[PDB]
Design a protein around this ligand. Structure first.
Ligand SMILES: Nc1ncnc2c1ncn2[C@@H]1O/C(=C/[C@@H](N)CC[C@H](N)C(=O)O)[C@@H](O)[C@H]1O
Ligand SMILES: Nc1ncnc2c1ncn2[C@@H]1O/C(=C/[C@@H](N)CC[C@H](N)C(=O)O)[C@@H](O)[C@H]1O
Ligand SMILES: Nc1ncnc2c1ncn2[C@@H]1O/C(=C/[C@@H](N)CC[C@H](N)C(=O)O)[C@@H](O)[C@H]1O
Lengths: 8, 625, 625, 625, 8, 8
């Protein structure tokens, strides 16, 4: 969300 | 809702104590693993040869209970930083013994004190245990907001308490923590168990802990006030600190004896539950962003990559954004077509980067409410989204909408536009390459044509967050520069952090662009006044945009569009943390760079100290054209 | 229990079809994402400019439904390996288009056929899509056990079917899969959708698929037989294949039309459920090992490391192991003390590596059932376990047991032992360093003394498992040799694999050791006859031990102690897979090496081809002394 | 010129022997470090306790002499692969002892025999010493062309010699070497000391050693023939082998006693000097390429990068290339302008990618010799080279030449050209992106216009070279994929290698390109017949170009333009070596891929075995547009 | 289990 | 030389 992708 | 534990230094029977504690409503017990008075000798005879079991058996509880209900506590006699060599040596051996027993038991956490300035040898022994076997357990450093020496009663005749303000001096316990974690090289298994006193220090001492990995808050029963009914309560200032800690989802720890003797023990815990229930309910944004607090994400690149169906579906869930676009188109149509030209004047509207069609629908709603005639083109380079658009065009829109499967920079438009509408904005405004895209589309906008958005500005603000610094640090990947993770921005819902100075404007772009050869490259110097003692870890990025005249969108905290969750802030980290003293200025330099293939940012801190230039030539991060 | 899907090539209405399929009891639907007959042109005008939507909208289903209920299917006209240049080019563009739409939709899996020998360009286009964006989706390669060309009816007059055995020829479809996955460099996102025919091939063709990543089994309705009641059933041989596939937890896919017209459709799926319910229930070992199938683990090192409480608790859950030790001690006591010496002869028993006390308890039970007198010492180097032992000694055992907190190699025993009892065995027998430990303890065993265990032997067997090879491959870590993961053994409950030759003995140790200067270093050459066409990926390791006389423990599959789950096999991988032809010999070389600080294994394959020597000088793996 | 050593197995006095050997003209001495008959015991008493020094002192020679003049020799009794356990153990300890003494002495090289099929334990002990301390010394494996068992006199009555051809059997000693080096994992410190016998084997046995790291050639005195004067000489076939070895710059080793008793000893070495002096002198190309033999280089990218002054200076040193361009322009001018139009017809010539001006000068010389009028444009994107061009234009050329500082793909030409001349060719023809560059320039060439070059074709040939494979292997760099070095081409003057099949055409481009939308992407399958037993390590790449009609340039070995050294071949390696048997077919697949930003190659071997696809999506190597 | 540690 | 750069 909030213009982001990926992460964990 | 509230996760709470009991802290005891006396456990005569482990099974009986756990039961009593669970009955009181506590979720865990912080307790000694070896008797706190049972001092042990490792070097000198005869005491080193003391027989019998050194402690209680692991068989007293199930593996599940040791793993989930018990937090270990370091024995109070263990003094690895003692001036006495013999105590120092016995303490190192006892500390290693107790930490190894905790790991043997599978304890979820182990408590260690920070109760003096020098904990060098305690850090060395802890770092050594961390680099020995099983890497799961957490170490909770028990550190007070206010050091015992600074809250002692003024009852020593020849040693009066200091009644003078010592700005940095009252922040001393933070430096105890800072030095300790620096020594242990920011291990993620090392966190804070913040102990709260009867009297709170000044706000600057409390705020010093912002951005710190606080896992627990320790509340002695002696800090609780008594109400008319005789039940434990807290001062308004203490309640204000509890509310801040509840947002960090800390585990609360109740230490000390029952001081509300004729009012039972679970009453302390019942009060924390009361405060937890009686807090402000989260807004539309806060309910939406739940789970994303401090979660680092890669910024979307809708130009270089084709967004997925669910990504467009997330965009579309924001009611505020599109109702703002509709209002901007509505006002523009009224300004361009007088009432008398209502039925003859057909405005040519181009939605540049149409996705799955919400701005096309927003344009049609805008034309209906303005009672004006429009001719629409929906331009989209992503062929997958073009499927949705073409199915919408056949089923609903009809001939009024012409769907164009093309890059706006290449499209040979058959007619010029009155209005070009786009939403090509990132969390740092120009980071999705809206300037380059709209520059290429500019030639098909009429001489008196309007671009929605008309303008956008990015903003930067220095931040402190040892929590986020460690989060970026853990993004080291194989087959790339070991420091590349610090040379790239992250989209992140900033939560456990301290904003160090007011956001200042960084880069501005205006559409249509009437400065021949454009030059979207930029260089900005920003000087941020800092009124606190702190540590700089990076820059928070935000933006504002003028859709049309007074119709705007903003993610800048001070002017944030209410209920709009399409963009979280961006974070530009720095490789090495920078100490900043109260009254100093943070000077940052930001560049927007490009070639014909890529666009990137480069950044550097030049005051109070210089950093390296981050991301030179886009070596770690680029935005594909 | 059984996860099943429906395969369709005709979906007139997506919502109506999904509903009908869900009602039938299916969990998913394999379906075309673009109309299977809708051939598209990308290069030549006028057809390249075909208007309208290229397919159905993503809006027809929820994101959850696309993510969980739909498996995409590649269009049948897409032929990237065509002899015609124009078809090859249009197919590459269409394949990339369809795979990108599948990723746009967030499909959990996408089906692609392997229906001819040459799929070089299909692999190239697939590898290219894999190295482009979102890396979550699975690719299921639809490959038959028996190629359509080899099961065609013998009805062509001038082209008779081959009635001669072609051993390797009938294994052709495996080579289609093997070449494809080699080309795509063993991507873990590339798996097999094995299609089953009306007639099964020879066992060697079926076994060729052992150790392969089978994610799905495709069952055409045409392979089902009819019973007296008119309901679909399967031949005994087909049922035998279903049972093998159920152990691999494959998802079953039902393809084709209803051939049991007057018996409804869900009947095919009801039969699979029947077979699933009517299977042998798992034994004590199988129920214990559930979750550990092909799960790679580091072998425990109880000497170098101090085991955790829960590790000892897992050891203690094995009822067979200790009842065997008790029987071995019981027989030894009877052989050493005649009935007439019953009340005067006190045997000195030392439990060397006592852990939390089960062998101490086993020794006392053994002495009670033998009606003999014992004097016990429980020696343990782990001080954490020593806590449990000392609490047991005070509370229960008493003076009969002397707990010793020491390394058996350093302990100055005050008396010599009649029997030394130990359980210092790893999955490869000597891998926990039982020889080095018992060699150091040997001096305190009497001249006529007995060691339990008296002997142990390790065993090796060559194995094939592309599943495990890929599992080891994914263990590449930062800051170490990029190939170190292949130079170390793993404890693993081997499941999806093929044992290629009978286990052969590798290394033997006997206690007490009466060959002066001992020399625990070893060198073994093993020659394994292989009767199949296969691929060598590593060696399975097992062991047997003689506790006393006929009382043994074994993990060798052929002589496995029933219900004993203390040890899973060990796996020694090889860096590069080795092709082995039927009738060839696998020659492996294994070394047991040491210095005064560490012990390690080194290994190499020398026939049919040489491998590198693995783990030279213990560069990737060592066992601390 | 020739570096030669003496091999002795008897050195009674080290200082006296070295002196005698140096006087004879030898540069080094291969000698035992321990007495070759002095068998030592390490395990059994009393012999293990043998007193006195185990060998000669290091003090007998200077450090410089040990470092430069002495090659150690392993004792002949050391048999690590013995069937006897005791010999195997004593040999491992003695081998480690002797290798450690050699490293103690700082010996430049140490000789070890390969005199039987199984040297598994010798490889294990050697690999272990290599991974222990100082990594400078070389190990020379003494291996014969023909095994002693295969050259024994036919004098055993009940054991006749085999008079039948055993194709693979006669290549046995190569497999001894191959297995040994595979076991030692291609250490670069492990090389071949090839021993030559009285009778040479068939050419296929000799050629088997092509591409192998031969550091020394061993010549026994017994292989030398005697001439009319009584001096040692060699057979014509032996001389042919000496000449091949001289090109590899091997060190020659003279072993055995003086068999030319009444003709002195240095005579053997005098003959080698004679052969060395009496060899063909190197040509213009060979003298130019001296130092670049097997030296891997990055292929130049003149489009993405701006070449340096000295790079253009190297280009200009090739007299053949430009005289060919001049001849091609000369013929074109005569074909385009009839004699009668001599003074009225001015041909517009554009040099596209002019560098420092040699093709501009070639065009003017061509126009003078054709007696025709030209109007020249010199187009160059590199501004540094534009400086040289503009200084040439002012000082010499004048108004006849218009220098254009532009990319030919962007230049708005003011006039159309009659002829476009370019030299944008790489070692693999299209690898510098000549197709993309000339495609963009095509629009300014007249309808009947000529492009020089008119056409070019790349060629591929499979090669064997364990020397080059190891050279690519050593190109592993930090912060990138550990296998990226195998997924990129290298410009290399191939020297120690074996070409396995005749070069076959890969990709062709024609200018002007009259196949709308061009499509410079390509896919080629090549099938190479192989008549030898070998190991595949990569593909050599070459090209041919038609400048105009019969005027060509070629680097294809069979049609190589004489004296032209502008391009060395290119090498496409493969990650894993592939065994190829005589009569098998090597099938390779090559792709030319692109996007709007980059061009790259992808390649795979599909027969006799599949390799992974190399460089998918240009992950390791790309050519910037 | 089965004499192993770690993994995931 | 021969259209190459770098190396050592
Ligand atoms: N040069 C371009 N030409 C056409 N579409 C583009 C270009 N660059 C980005 N886009 C698309 O425009 C897009 C815009 C999005 N940032 C917003 C999507 C949509 N308008 C929505 O607000 O829901 C993505 O769909 C991109 O595929
Ligand atoms: N040199 C040694 N001296 C004493 N204990 C050792 C030594 N090496 C290993 N051990 C211990 O002996 C052990 C044995 C285990 N493999 C079995 C444990 C236990 N007897 C049980 O069967 O439940 C671990 O507890 C180790 O700490
Ligand atoms: N698109 C382009 N436009 C103009 N010059 C180019 C382009 N691509 C490459 N070149 C130049 O043309 C060149 C050609 C060289 N391969 C040969 C140089 C020169 N003609 C010589 O034979 O000595 C380099 O000087 C490049 O800078």
């Amino acid at each position: 969300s909030g213009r982001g992708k990926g992460g964990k | 809702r509230v996760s709470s534990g009991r802290d005891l230094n006396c456990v005569p029977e482990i099974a009986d104590t756990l039961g009593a504690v669970a009955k009181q409503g506590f979720d865990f017990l912080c307790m000694p693993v070896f008797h706190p008075r049972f001092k042990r000798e490792f070097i000198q005879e005869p005491a080193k040869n003391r027989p019998g079991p050194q402690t209680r058996s692991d068989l007293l509880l199930s593996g599940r209970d040791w793993n989930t209900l018990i937090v270990g506590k370091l024995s109070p006699w263990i003094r690895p930083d003692s001036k006495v060599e013999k105590i120092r040596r016995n303490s190192e051996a006892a500390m290693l013994q107790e930490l190894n027993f905790g790991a043997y038991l599978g304890l979820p956490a182990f408590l260690l004190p920070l109760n003096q300035e020098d904990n060098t040898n305690l850090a060395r022994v802890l770092t050594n245990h961390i680099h020995t076997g099983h890497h799961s357990s957490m170490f909770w450093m028990r550190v007070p907001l206010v050091a015992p020496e600074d809250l002692r009663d003024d009852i020593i005749e020849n040693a009066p308490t200091t009644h003078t303000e010592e700005y940095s001096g009252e922040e001393k316990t933070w430096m105890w923590w800072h030095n300790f974690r620096t020594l242990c090289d920011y291990s993620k298994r090392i966190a804070v168990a913040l102990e709260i006193g009867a009297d709170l220090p000044s706000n600057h001492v409390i705020d010093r802990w912002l951005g710190e990995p606080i896992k627990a808050a320790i509340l002695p029963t002696s800090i609780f006030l008594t109400n008319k009914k005789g039940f434990p309560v807290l001062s308004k200032m203490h309640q204000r600190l509890i509310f801040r800690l509840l947002k960090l989802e800390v585990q609360f720890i109740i230490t000390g004896t029952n001081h509300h003797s004729e009012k039972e023990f679970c009453s302390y815990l019942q009060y924390l539950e009361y405060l937890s229930q009686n807090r402000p309910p989260p807004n539309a944004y806060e309910l939406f962003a739940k789970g994303y607090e401090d979660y680092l994400q890669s910024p979307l690149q809708p130009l270089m990559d084709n967004l997925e169906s669910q990504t467009y579906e997330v965009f579309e869930k924001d009611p505020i954004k599109y109702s703002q676009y509709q209002q901007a188109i509505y006002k523009c149509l009224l300004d361009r077509v007088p009432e008398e030209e209502k039925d003859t004047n057909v405005q040519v509207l181009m939605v540049l980067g149409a996705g799955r069609g919400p701005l096309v629908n927003a344009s049609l709603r805008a034309a209906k409410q303005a009672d004006r005639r429009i001719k629409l083109y929906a331009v989209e380079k992503n062929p997958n989204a073009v499927v949705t658009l073409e199915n919408w065009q056949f089923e609903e829109w009809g001939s009024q909408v012409t769907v164009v499967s093309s890059d706006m920079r290449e499209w040979v438009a058959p007619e010029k536009a009155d209005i070009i509408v786009s939403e090509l904005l990132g969390s740092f405004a120009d980071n999705e390459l809206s300037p380059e895209c709209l520059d290429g589309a500019q030639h098909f906008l009429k001489d008196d044509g309007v671009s929605i958005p008309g303008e956008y500005t990015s903003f930067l603000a220095p931040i402190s967050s040892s929590k986020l610094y460690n989060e970026v640090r853990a993004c080291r990947e194989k087959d790339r520069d070991p420091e590349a993770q610090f040379e790239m921005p992250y989209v992140v819902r900033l939560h456990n952090f301290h904003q160090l100075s007011a956001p200042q404007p960084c880069f501005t772009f205006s559409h249509p662009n009437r400065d021949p050869m454009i030059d979207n490259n930029r260089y900005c110097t920003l000087e941020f006044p800092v009124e606190v003692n702190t540590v700089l870890h990076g820059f928070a990025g935000y933006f504002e945009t003028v859709l049309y005249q007074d119709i705007t969108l903003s993610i800048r905290p001070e002017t944030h569009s209410p209920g709009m969750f399409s963009w979280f802030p961006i974070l530009f980290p720095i490789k090495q943390p920078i100490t900043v003293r109260e009254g100093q200025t943070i000077c940052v330099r930001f560049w927007r760079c490009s070639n014909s293939k890529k666009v990137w940012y480069e950044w550097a801190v030049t005051a109070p100290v210089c950093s390296a230039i981050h991301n030179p030539t886009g070596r770690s991060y680029t935005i594909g054209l």
